[PDB]
Subunit: 351 residues, 2 copies
């Protein structure tokens, strides 16, 4: 139940728990997730992999596969990650919608002010007032879609969450355990499967693990990527470094399963490393935006005062407020991309 | 004419048939007042056996003497009021009827669904698969579902009653008009709808009558006090003119009347100068207060309309996904890929969502009736 300790936000944990209760039947869960995603269009490569692989097998093969433990772990991961994803989408939409509405208000005072005092300028204000109103209906629809996804993943009773103001706080990720054992990744279903294949080619998993799976810490003394993890991918090259050493012979179908293994292993470590760097990188971006935002807030406060003393036109206050709105949106995109990356991470670690 | 208001407002043909029939059977205004009172009475039957417009109208009437009542019912605004009362009430009762037919249809579908899941949980049990409290649960929800079937059946009868009363002895009550889930939106109103339409409200007709009793220049009073804007935008939404009549997040009213021409002559002089002024002042303050309120009502109705539209649109989307998910679950069941109970659970989701959609649609219809009322009997010129 890694989900419980991985997602900080308590609402998304409520949602996940609820979805876990209602999704006893594995095949049904597969349906719900499929419809929650299909309702959008025609990353989530974990999803693409899973559905494609499932759709390329006979019905009899599917029912067998969903009995294996790796499939039940995969589906659990699919369910949890999709609920969390649906929620972030919902929260993203409430917030972009909320900013577009304040934006619409601002632009409408900006219109009325201009006319009171060019017609070229006046009609540009009619241009954005509309594309802002069309934007509003766009976000209204994304909201409906996220809501659709959430009802589906859970159950009938339409008690959805409202706009969580939980910002300036859940703007940042879970602190990862310092010294997290790379052996967490043996619980990835892709790696679990690779080892079943190893057992099929008559191999000793112990020696297979010893020879090919590096035992390291994934995180540093902080919660950042460990120096060990970085040292597995040649700088500038960005390519896997590890040389497997065969002490104990691996075997008691064959040299396919070993290369499958080395390929899954190297990629799992790569997914974790990308996730760690991106997460760290998004931290920095968000934090800078946040400091910028505060500088905009006082600028608007100060512009508000000046206007009261006749020192600037009202349009200056409106422009100061547009800047504030522009940054709040950027924050929101960045944060959202953080949450999507967190889900990548959770999935990469395998539950 | 003047049937033009409801004929061009209510988009549903069946309801337009019923309205037309009730008008024919109610040629006498006082009797229609009776039939409406009594049609409303026997909904309130649910508590004597164990709309702001109608309250205002009926309240107004009992507060007067019988001589006053007969005088009022001979005025132009009263005939207008009785027209709208009769139209709005026939519409309401029909929607009630269709609501009940619909809630009933779902409740019976639900009952069959719970019976099939009872028959499964029992076969399960005697093959050592279920809890005995599971059987208990199944039996409870069936019993309470039989209760609802009886309750909806009660409400259907209350609405049929109300309809027969408004329609008369020879009126045919409609059967269940089965609903298309993709045609649940409202009548698109004319664009640029003139505020002048509001002068046909009974309350405003009365205000102007009082104005003329105190010898106002009506033209002058209208120019001074009645905003001459458009009510609707390029579509079917509250226009910006309408919106700007109310202070943003106060609800407070922004129109400042400016009197260019005096509304009242300097009196016939010494004919109770300070008393005629009083009556003059009263009719003015009253006109102005009826106007703000007429505009507010329409604004609120247009907003409620927009909102319900969004909510319905969202339910229709949830439903389409539930429908696809059910078909897929049924096919999977046919391949042994899922339990029969999973299909029944999926069907129950479809049912709940259908009920929510019916509630929403009904609130949409009550709001149309409200709009039609607020406008003063349609949006026809």
């Amino acid at each position: 139940a890694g989900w419980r300790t991985f997602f900080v936000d308590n609402q998304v944990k409520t949602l996940i728990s609820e979805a876990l209760v209602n999704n006893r039947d594995l095949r049904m869960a597969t349906l719900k997730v499929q419809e929650a995603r299909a309702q959008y269009r025609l990353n989530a490569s974990f999803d693409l992999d899973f559905f494609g692989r499932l759709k390329n097998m006979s019905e009899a093969e599917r029912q067998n596969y969903l009995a294996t433990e790796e499939a039940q772990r995969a589906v659990h991961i699919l369910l949890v990650s999709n609920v969390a994803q649906s929620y972030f989408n919902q929260q993203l939409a409430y917030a972009q919608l909320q900013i577009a509405e304040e934006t619409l208000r601002n632009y409408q005072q900006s219109y009325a002010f201009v006319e009171k005092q060019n017609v070229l300028a006046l009609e540009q204000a009619r241009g954005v007032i509309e594309s802002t109103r069309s934007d509003i209906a766009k976000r209204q629809g994304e909201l409906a879609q996220a809501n659709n996804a959430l009802q589906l993943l859970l159950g009938s009773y339409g008690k959805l969450p409202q706009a969580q103001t939980v910002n300036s706080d859940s703007l940042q990720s879970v602190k990862l355990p310092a010294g997290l054992s790379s052996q967490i990744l043996l619980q990835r279903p892709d790696i679990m499967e690779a080892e079943h294949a190893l057992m099929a080619a008559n191999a000793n998993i112990g020696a297979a693990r010893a020879a090919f799976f590096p035992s390291i810490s994934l995180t540093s003394g902080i919660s950042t990527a460990s120096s060990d993890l970085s040292s597995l991918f040649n700088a500038s090259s960005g390519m896997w470094n590890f040389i497997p050493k065969i002490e104990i012979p691996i075997f008691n179908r064959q040299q396919q399963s070993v290369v499958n293994y080395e390929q899954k292993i190297q990629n799992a470590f790569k997914e974790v490393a990308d996730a760690l760097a991106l997460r760290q990188s998004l931290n920095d971006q968000i934090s800078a935006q946040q400091r910028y935002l505060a500088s905009l807030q006082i600028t608007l406060q100060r512009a508000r005062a000046l206007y009261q003393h006749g020192a600037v036109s009202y349009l200056e206050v409106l422009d100061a407020e547009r800047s504030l709105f522009a940054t709040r949106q950027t924050l929101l995109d960045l944060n959202y991309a953080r949450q999507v990356n967190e889900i990548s991470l959770y999935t990469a670690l395998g539950g």
